[PDB]
Write a protein that binds this DNA or RNA. Structure first.
Ligand SMILES: [Zn+2]
Ligand SMILES: [Zn+2]
Length: 431
RNA sequence: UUUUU
């Protein structure tokens, strides 16, 4: 049995790993590259898509399913297994990819063709290919997210996919993986733990209470797939102690995802399922408004607070959020709250450096608004959680992380008496 | 830590 990394090697985007065992070739994920590597989505896979027997997708995020349609575009016609939630979410993520894609590398037909081969596979259901046995494990990173357990030829492999931050409340706790001969694991936060969640929430509530009281605007850059909805959940469960204010989910995509959530009730934590059982959607706080078009979106830039605005891009790389920052950063009564990681080198990092004035949309703008960074909202297991999940595993191969981050985790794993390496692109690893 | 008017 062997596993060949074909993305997310010494980097975070591009997840796709070819499992060679049981007499078959199974591709684990097939995400796109994002950021500076984006052009690479136009380059070849490094393997023959027509020679793939099946595909399993851990979760709906673009860096795990973005290249799936290129796979079909290039001949693949086999099944693609994923949980119903991933299937449902993927549809939304793929349609959006088409629209907002600079230089596309697949077309609408490649997408309908890809979605056409999706077959449901839920946690605790074994898939059988030749002498290979595959199952999904609970990852707690997104609704329907999972890690993969592959057993064949007398050996056991586990592919973590992306693990969640078990401290948060929306998703259920990640399951522990089975004891394996090899674990291909992510290490996004290999260098450090996250600030405790409960502590992050209180600080979050304090910032909102303070800002909305003085009639200011609370600007929140958010990702449309789970982050935004998680914020609303907090607003619903604790907003009772906040001054009255409209909450604008200024993201059509986050809107579509929100609408889908009630259909995915069983994929959330017991806490969230219990709310739904009482007929109460915990993702819809009082004052929730979903902004569909540009006109109303821009109108918010000139309308006074108090208000809470949720918008993308979550990493400030374009989107309505920029327009809100352009017109709201100059007012000291407002507040910019980051609830997700900002890649060093980008606009977020600059803002956080607190310079006298940052440049947005081709223009310098004074930075008077207060700024906060709540990494505690992260959707990835922090180093400490990564260490707990990996506990007792003889061998670990690290992917999905910046080289330094992966090294930091590796150092600790090696010191713990566990064999570890940083996966290399195309370099098969025996299981 | 991944699309977005
Ligand atoms: Zn993810
Ligand atoms: Zn990922």
């Amino acid at each position: 049995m062997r596993i060949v990394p074909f993305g997310a090697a010494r980097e975070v985007t591009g997840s796709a790993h070819l499992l060679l065992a049981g007499g078959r070739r199974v591709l684990l994920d097939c995400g796109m590259f994002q950021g500076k590597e984006e052009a690479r989505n136009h380059a070849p896979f490094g393997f023959d898509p027509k020679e793939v027997d099946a595909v399993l997708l851990t979760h709906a995020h673009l860096d795990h399913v973005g290249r799936l349609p290129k796979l079909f575009r290039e001949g693949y016609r086999g099944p693609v297994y994923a949980t119903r939630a991933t299937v449902l979410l993927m549809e939304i993520v793929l349609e959006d990819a088409l629209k907002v894609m600079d230089e596309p590398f697949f077309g609408p037909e490649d997408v309908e063709e890809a979605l056409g081969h999706l077959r449901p596979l839920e946690y605790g259901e074994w898939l059988r290919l030749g002498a290979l046995s595959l199952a999904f494990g609970q990852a707690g990173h997104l609704p329907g997210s999972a890690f993969v357990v592959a057993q064949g030829e007398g050996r056991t492999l586990v592919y973590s996919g992306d693990l969640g931050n078990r401290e948060k409340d929306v998703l259920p706790d990640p399951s522990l993986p089975p004891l394996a001969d090899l674990v291909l694991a992510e290490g996004t936060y290999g260098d450090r733990p996250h600030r405790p969640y409960r502590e992050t929430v209180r600080e979050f509530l304090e910032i909102l209470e303070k800002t909305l009281s003085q009639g200011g605007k609370v600007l929140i850059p958010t990702f449309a797939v789970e982050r935004a909805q998680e914020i609303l959940y907090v607003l619903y469960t604790h907003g009772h102690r906040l001054p009255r204010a409209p909450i604008y989910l200024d993201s059509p995509m986050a809107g579509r995802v929100l609408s889908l959530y009630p259909r995915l009730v069983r994929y959330f934590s017991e806490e969230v399922q219990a709310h739904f059982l009482q007929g109460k959607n915990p993702f819809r706080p009082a004052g929730l408004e979903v902004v569909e078009h540009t006109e109303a979106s821009k109108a918010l830039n000139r309308a006074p607070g108090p208000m809470v605005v949720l918008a993308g891009s979550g990493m400030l790389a374009g989107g309505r959020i920029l327009h809100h920052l352009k017109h709201g950063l100059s007012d000291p009564r407002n507040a910019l709250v980051f609830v997700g990681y900002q890649p060093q080198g980008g606009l977020g990092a600059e803002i956080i450096a607190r310079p006298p004035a940052v440049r947005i949309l081709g223009e310098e703008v004074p930075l008077r608004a207060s700024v906060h960074t709540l990494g505690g909202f992260s959707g990835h297991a922090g180093q400490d959680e990564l260490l707990d999940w990996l506990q007792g595993e003889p061998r670990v191969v690290l992917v999905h992380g910046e080289e330094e981050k992966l090294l930091a985790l590796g150092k600790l794993l090696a010191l713990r008496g566990q064999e570890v390496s940083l996966a290399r692109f195309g370099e098969g690893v025996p299981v």
